[PDB]
Short mmCIF file of C-alpha atoms in Angstrom, two decimals:
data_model
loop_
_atom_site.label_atom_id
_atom_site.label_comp_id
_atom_site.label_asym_id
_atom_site.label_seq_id
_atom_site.Cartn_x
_atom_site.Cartn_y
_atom_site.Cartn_z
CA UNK A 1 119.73 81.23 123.58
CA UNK A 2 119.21 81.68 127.62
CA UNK A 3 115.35 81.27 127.12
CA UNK A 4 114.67 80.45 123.53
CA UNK A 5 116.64 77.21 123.89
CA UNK A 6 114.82 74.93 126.52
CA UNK A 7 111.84 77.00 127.36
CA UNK A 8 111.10 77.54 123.56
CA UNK A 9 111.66 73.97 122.87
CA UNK A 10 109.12 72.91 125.52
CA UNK A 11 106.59 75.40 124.69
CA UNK A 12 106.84 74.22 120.96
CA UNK A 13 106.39 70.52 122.12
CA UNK A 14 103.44 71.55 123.91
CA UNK A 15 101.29 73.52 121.28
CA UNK A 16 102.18 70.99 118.69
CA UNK A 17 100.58 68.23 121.04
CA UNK A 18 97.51 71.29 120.98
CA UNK A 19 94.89 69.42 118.31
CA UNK A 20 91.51 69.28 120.02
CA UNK A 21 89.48 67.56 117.18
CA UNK A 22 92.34 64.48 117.27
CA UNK A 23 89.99 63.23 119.53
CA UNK A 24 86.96 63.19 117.26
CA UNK A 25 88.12 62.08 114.36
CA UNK A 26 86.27 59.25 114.07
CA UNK A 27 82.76 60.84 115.10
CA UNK A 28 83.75 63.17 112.35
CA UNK A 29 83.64 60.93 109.69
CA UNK A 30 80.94 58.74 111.30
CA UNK A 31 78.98 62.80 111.50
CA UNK A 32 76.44 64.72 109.33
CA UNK A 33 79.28 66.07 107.60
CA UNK A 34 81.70 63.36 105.89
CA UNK A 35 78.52 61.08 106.01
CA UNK A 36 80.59 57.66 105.97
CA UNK A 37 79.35 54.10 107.48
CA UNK A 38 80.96 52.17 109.65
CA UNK A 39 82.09 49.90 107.57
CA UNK A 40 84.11 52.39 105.39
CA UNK A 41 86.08 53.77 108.76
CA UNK A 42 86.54 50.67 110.49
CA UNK A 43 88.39 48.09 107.52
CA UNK A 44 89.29 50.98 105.17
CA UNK A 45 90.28 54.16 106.58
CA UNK A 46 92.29 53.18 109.91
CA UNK A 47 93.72 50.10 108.73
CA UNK A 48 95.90 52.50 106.45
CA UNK A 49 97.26 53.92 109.68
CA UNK A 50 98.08 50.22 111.15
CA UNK A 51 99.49 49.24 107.62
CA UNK A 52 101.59 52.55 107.13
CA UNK A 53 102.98 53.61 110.61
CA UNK A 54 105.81 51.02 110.11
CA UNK A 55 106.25 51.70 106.79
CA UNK A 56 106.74 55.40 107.50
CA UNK A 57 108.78 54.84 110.46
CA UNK A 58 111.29 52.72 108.72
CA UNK A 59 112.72 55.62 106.67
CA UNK A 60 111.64 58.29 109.64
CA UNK A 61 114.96 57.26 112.11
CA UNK A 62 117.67 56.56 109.09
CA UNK A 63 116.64 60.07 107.80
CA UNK A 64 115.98 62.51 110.93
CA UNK A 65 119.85 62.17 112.60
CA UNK A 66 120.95 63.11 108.60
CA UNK A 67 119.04 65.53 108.02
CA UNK A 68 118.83 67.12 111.70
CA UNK A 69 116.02 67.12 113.63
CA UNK A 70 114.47 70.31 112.32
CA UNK A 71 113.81 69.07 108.94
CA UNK A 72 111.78 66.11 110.46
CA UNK A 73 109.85 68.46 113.02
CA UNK A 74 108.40 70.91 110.67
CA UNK A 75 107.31 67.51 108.04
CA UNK A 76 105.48 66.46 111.03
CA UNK A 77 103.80 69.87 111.52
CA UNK A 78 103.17 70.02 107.79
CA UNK A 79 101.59 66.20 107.84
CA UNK A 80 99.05 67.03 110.34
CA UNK A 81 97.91 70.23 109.08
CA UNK A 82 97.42 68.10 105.95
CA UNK A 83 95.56 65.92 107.98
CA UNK A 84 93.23 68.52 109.26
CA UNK A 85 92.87 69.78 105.52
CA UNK A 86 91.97 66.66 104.33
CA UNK A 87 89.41 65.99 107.45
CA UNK A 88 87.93 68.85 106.05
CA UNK A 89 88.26 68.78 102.24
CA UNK A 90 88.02 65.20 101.39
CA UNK A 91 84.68 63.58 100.45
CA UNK A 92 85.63 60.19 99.28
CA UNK A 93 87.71 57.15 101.26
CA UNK A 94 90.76 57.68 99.41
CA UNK A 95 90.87 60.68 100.92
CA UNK A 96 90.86 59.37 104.21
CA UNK A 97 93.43 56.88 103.38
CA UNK A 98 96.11 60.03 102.14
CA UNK A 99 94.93 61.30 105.49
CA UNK A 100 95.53 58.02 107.83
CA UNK A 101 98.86 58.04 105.71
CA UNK A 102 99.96 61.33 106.70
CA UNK A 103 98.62 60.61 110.16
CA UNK A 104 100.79 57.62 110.61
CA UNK A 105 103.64 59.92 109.50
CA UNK A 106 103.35 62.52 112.09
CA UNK A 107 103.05 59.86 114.65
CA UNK A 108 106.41 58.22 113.68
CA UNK A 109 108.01 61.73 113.09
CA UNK A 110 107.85 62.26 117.16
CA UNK A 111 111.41 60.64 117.85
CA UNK A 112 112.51 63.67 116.15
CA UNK A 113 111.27 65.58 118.96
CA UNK A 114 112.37 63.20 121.17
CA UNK A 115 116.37 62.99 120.15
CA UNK A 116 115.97 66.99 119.23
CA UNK A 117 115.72 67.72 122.65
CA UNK A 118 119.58 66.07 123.58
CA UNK A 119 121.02 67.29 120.58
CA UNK A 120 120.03 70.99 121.29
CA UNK A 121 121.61 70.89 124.96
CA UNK A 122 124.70 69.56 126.95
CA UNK A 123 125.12 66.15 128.10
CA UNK A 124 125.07 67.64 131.46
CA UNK A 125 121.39 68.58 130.99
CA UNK A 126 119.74 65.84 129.41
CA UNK A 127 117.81 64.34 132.18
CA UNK A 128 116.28 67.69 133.20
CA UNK A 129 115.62 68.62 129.25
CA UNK A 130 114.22 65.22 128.83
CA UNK A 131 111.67 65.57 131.50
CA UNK A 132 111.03 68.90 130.62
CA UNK A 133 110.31 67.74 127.32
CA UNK A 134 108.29 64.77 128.31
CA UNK A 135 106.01 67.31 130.47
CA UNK A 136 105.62 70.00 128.05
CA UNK A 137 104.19 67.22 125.56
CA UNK A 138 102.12 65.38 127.39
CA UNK A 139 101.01 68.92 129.24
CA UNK A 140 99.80 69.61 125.42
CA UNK A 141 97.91 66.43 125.23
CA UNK A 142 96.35 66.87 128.35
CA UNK A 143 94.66 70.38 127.28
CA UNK A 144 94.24 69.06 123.71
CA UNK A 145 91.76 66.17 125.13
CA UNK A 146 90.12 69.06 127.85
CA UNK A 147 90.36 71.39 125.22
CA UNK A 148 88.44 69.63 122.63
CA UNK A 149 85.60 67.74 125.27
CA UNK A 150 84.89 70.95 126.66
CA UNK A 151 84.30 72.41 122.87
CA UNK A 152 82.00 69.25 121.88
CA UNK A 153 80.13 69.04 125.68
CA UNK A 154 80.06 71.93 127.57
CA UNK A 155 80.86 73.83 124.33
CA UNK A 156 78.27 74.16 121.57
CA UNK A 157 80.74 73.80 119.04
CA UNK A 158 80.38 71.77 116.13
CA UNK A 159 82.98 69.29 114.71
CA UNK A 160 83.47 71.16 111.78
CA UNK A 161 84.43 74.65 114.00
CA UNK A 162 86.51 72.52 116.57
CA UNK A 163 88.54 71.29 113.55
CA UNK A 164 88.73 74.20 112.10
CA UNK A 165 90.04 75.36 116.24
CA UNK A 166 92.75 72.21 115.47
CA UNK A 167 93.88 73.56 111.96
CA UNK A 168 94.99 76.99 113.46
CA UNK A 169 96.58 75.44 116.41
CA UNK A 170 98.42 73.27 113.60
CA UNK A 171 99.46 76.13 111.52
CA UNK A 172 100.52 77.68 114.79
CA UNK A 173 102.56 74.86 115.42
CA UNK A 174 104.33 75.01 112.09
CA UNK A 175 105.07 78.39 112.32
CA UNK A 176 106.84 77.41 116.15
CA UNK A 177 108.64 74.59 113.96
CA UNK A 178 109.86 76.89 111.75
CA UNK A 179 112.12 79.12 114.29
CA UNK A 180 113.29 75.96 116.09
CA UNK A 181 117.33 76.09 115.90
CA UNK A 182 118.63 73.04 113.32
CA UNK A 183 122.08 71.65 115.66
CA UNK A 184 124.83 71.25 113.61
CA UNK A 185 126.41 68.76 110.55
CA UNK A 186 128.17 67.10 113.23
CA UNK A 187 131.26 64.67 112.62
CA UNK A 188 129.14 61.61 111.78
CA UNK A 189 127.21 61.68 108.48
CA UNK A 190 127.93 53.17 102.42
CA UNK A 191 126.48 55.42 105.15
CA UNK A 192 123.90 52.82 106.56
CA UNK A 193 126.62 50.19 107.04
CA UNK A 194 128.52 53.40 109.20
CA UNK A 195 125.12 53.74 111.51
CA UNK A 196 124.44 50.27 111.57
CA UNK A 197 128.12 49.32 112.26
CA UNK A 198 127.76 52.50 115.26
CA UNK A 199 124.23 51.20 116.34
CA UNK A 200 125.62 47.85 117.51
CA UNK A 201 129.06 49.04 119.32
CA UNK A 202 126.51 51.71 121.07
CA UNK A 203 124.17 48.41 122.00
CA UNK A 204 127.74 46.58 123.15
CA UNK A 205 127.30 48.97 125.90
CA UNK A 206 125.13 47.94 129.16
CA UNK A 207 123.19 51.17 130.18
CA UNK A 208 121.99 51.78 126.49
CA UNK A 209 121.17 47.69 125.91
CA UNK A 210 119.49 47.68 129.19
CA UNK A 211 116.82 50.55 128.55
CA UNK A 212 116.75 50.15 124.94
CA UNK A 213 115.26 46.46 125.99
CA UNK A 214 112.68 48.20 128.17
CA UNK A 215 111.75 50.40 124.97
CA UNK A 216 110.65 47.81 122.72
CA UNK A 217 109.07 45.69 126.03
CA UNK A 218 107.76 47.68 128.37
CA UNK A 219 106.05 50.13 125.63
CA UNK A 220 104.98 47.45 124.16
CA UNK A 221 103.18 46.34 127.19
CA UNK A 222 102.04 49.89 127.98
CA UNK A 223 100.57 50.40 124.70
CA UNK A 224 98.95 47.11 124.46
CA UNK A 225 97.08 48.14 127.78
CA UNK A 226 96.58 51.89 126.71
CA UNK A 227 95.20 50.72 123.64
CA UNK A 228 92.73 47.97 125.05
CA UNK A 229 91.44 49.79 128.44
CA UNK A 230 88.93 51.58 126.12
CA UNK A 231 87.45 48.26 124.96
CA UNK A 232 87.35 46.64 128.32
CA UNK A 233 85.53 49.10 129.85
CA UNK A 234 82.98 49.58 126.68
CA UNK A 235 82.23 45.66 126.99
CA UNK A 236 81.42 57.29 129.54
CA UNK A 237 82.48 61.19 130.65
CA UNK A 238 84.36 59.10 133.21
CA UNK A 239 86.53 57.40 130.46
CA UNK A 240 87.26 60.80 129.47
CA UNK A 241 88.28 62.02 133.42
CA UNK A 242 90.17 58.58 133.35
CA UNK A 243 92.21 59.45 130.00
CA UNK A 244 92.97 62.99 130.92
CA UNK A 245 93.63 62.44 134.67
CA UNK A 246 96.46 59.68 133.44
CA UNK A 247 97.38 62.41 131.12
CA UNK A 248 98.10 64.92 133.47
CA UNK A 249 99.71 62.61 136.12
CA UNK A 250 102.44 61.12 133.20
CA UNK A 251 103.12 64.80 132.69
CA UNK A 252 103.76 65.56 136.50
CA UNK A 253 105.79 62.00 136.40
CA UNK A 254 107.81 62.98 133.34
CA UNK A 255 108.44 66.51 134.64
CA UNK A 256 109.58 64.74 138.40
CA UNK A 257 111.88 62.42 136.92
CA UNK A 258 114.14 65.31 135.53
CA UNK A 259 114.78 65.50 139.19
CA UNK A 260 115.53 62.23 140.62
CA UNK A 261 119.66 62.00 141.42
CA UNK A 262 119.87 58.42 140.74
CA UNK A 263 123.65 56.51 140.28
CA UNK A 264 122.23 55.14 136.77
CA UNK A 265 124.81 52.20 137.04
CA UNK A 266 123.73 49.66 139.99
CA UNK A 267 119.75 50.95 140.43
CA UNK A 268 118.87 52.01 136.79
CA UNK A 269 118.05 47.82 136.47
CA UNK A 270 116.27 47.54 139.94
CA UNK A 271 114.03 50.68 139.51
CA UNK A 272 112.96 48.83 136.06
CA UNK A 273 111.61 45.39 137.89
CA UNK A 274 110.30 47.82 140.75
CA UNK A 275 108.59 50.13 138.29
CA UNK A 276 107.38 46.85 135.96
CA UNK A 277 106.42 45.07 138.82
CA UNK A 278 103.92 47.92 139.86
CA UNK A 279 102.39 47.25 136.46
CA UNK A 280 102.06 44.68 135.98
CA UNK A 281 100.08 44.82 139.53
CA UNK A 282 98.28 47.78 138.00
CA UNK A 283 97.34 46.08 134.86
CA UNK A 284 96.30 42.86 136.82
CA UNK A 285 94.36 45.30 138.73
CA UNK A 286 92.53 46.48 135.98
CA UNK A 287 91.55 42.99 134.46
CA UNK A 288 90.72 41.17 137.31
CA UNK A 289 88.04 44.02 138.44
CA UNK A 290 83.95 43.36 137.83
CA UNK A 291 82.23 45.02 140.83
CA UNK A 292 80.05 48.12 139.40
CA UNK A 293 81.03 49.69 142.36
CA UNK A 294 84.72 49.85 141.90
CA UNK A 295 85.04 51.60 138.64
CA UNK A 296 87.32 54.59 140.76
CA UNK A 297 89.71 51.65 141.57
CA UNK A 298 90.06 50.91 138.29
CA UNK A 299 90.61 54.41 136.65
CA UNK A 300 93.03 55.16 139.44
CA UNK A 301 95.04 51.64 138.99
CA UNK A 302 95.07 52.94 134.61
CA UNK A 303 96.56 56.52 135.94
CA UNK A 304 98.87 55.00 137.99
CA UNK A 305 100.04 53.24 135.40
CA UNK A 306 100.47 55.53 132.38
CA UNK A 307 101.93 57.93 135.31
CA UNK A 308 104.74 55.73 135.83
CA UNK A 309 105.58 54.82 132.67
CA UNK A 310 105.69 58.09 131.59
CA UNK A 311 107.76 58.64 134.73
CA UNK A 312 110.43 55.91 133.28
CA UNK A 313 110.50 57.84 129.67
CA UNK A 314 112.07 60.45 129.81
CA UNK A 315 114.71 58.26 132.07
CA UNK A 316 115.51 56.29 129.25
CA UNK A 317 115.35 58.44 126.46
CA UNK A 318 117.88 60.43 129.03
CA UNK A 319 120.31 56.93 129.41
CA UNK A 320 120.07 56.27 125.68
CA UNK A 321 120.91 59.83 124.99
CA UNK A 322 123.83 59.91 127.42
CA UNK A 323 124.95 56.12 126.57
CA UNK A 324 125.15 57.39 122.92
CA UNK A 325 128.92 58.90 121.96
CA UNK A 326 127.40 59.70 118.20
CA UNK A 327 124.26 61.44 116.68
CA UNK A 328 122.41 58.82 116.27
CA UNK A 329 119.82 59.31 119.60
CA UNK A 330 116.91 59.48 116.81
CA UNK A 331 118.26 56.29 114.92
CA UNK A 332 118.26 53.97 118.13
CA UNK A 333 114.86 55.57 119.43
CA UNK A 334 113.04 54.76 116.02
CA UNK A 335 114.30 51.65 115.91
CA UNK A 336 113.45 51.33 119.62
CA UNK A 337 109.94 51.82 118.27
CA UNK A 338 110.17 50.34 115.32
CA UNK A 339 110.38 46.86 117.57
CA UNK A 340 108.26 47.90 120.12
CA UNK A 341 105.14 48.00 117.89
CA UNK A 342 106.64 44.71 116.39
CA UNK A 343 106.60 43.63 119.67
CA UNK A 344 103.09 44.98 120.32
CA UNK A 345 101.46 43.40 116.72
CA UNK A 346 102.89 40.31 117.74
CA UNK A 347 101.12 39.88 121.07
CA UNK A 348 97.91 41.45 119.39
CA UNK A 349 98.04 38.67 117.00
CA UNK A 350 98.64 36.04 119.51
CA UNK A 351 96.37 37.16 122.43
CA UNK A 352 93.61 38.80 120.49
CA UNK A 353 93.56 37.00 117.26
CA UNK A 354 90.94 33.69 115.54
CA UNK A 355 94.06 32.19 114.53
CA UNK A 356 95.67 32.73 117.64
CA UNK A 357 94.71 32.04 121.25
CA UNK A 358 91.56 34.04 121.12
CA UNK A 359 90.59 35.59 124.40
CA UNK A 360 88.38 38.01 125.55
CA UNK A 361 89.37 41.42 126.63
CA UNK A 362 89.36 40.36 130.21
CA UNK A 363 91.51 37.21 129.30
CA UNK A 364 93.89 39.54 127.04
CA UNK A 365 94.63 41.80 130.45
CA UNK A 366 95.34 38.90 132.39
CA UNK A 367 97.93 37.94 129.67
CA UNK A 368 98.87 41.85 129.70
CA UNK A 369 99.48 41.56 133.25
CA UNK A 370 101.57 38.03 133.24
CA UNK A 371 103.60 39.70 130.23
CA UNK A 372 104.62 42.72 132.51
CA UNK A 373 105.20 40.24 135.56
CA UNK A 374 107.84 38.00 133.37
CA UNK A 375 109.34 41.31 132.25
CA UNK A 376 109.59 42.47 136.39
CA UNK A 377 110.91 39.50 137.10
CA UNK A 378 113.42 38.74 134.02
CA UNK A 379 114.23 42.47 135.16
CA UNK A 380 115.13 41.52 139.19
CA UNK A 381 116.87 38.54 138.35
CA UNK A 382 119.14 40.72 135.66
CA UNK A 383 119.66 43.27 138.81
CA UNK A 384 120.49 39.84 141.32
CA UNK A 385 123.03 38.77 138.90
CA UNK A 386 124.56 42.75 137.94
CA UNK A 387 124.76 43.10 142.15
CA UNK A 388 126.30 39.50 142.45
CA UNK A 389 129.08 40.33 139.65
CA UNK A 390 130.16 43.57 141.81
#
């Protein structure tokens, strides 16, 4: 339990983030192999991810604080190596589908990881086991991505091999899952009017309200620019250096904010608006750039910004965790993202939509920027009025 505990925790985080053909999915299917058009991938195979994510999520946070966090972890595990066995056993689009389904699963079954990490440790660790956590996973995304473009470029592996690569690093990953130690019944545990009833005295509190509001905003934000950097720029290897360099930086962020000795009571608001305000410069950095000279600018101002909100994560997945007096960290951080991508569809629709106010992807980073800029400064005046009520 010395070792096996924390280290063992973070080196399972990390080699379940290990799948280098996650990547290459879509080439996959668009390949010599699966032989599917465009048409078939585009507005029938990852819309059942869009549709589905939410749908899985819903259940995802009642069930993992019930069942522990174990339970959840190793469905995950089991959901993407069906995912890989479906990549490379199904023929027709329903196949797919199953395989966007289970897809959308594992990626709402990662607040399981993310609460597992508090309730395996002492409250007196959980900012350090937070960032540790946050680095060992995005440390495994960063070598997934390097792992799988050096297999498919400087590698003269094929897409069926590096899958094949993924699969064992999946069933790997299960077998990790399978020794990870399940924390106990504890006290808590109708039973949804109980963790609704101890969701909203837990909110009544300032230090989990306060971060749980930059959860469903600020990722919200952050994914909304994650998501749509790859379109602006397309309207290449250095897309790739772009994604992994943010990659690694959000892990070095995630692993230095373990460290930070901050009095999370009268700065935890001001280092939001300082941290949103950066991007929201960042983000307005990226949209308002056109010179084909300046493309390093650009990249930089992305990794700069996935670096620090990867540095604010693990914070508040720390302040929720420590703000919580219950075992329900998984139930507020699904429902944390459970808003968050409400919050996200919602400006999708309404920036990027016909019926909405249709921009283009230069436009919708402007907005992007003037979204994060309200939130900085809704964020400063919060922190003016906390420091005038001393």
């Amino acid at each position: 339990s010395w070792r096996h505990l924390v280290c063992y925790l973070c080196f399972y985080g990390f080699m379940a983030q290990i799948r280098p053909g996650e990547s290459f999915i879509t080439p996959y299917l668009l390949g010599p192999d699966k032989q599917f058009t465009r048409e078939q991938v585009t507005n029938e195979i990852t819309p059942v991810l869009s549709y589905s994510y939410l749908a899985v999520l819903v259940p995802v946070f009642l069930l993992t604080d019930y069942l522990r966090y174990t339970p959840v972890l190793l469905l995950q595990g089991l959901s993407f190596v069906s995912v890989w066995l479906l990549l490379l056993l199904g023929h027709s689009v329903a196949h797919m589908q199953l395989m966007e389904l289970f897809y959308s699963v594992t990626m709402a079954a990662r607040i399981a990881y993310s609460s597992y990490i508090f309730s395996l440790v002492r409250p007196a660790r959980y900012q350090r086991v937070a960032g540790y956590s946050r680095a060992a996973v995005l440390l495994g995304v960063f070598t997934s991505s390097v792992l799988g473009q050096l297999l498919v470029t400087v590698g003269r592996v094929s897409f069926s091999t590096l899958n094949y690569i993924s699969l064992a690093f999946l069933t790997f990953s299960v077998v990790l899952a399978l020794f990870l130690k399940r924390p106990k019944r504890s006290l808590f545990f109708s039973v949804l009017a109980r963790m609704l009833r101890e969701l909203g005295d837990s909110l009544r509190r300032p230090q989990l309200r306060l971060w749980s509001l930059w959860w469903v905003f600020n990722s919200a934000g952050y994914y909304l620019v994650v998501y749509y950097v790859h379109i602006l720029w397309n309207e290449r290897v250095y897309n790739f250096a772009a994604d992994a360099a943010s990659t690694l930086l959000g892990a070095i962020t995630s692993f230095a904010a373990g460290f930070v000795k901050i009095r999370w009571a009268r700065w935890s608001k001001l280092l939001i608006a300082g941290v949103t305000a950066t991007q929201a410069g960042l983000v307005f950095l990226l949209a308002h750039t056109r010179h084909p000279s300046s493309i390093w600018l650009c990249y930089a101002a992305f990794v700069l910004f996935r670096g620090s909100y990867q540095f604010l994560v693990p914070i508040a997945t720390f302040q929720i965790a420590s703000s919580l007096s219950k075992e329900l960290c998984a139930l507020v951080f699904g429902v944390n993202t459970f808003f968050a991508t409400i919050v996200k569809t919602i400006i999708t629709f309404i920036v990027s939509d016909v019926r909405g106010l249709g921009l283009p992807v230069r436009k919708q980073f402007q907005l992007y920027s003037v979204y994060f800029l309200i939130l900085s400064i809704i964020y400063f005046l919060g922190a003016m009025l906390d420091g005038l009520r001393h």
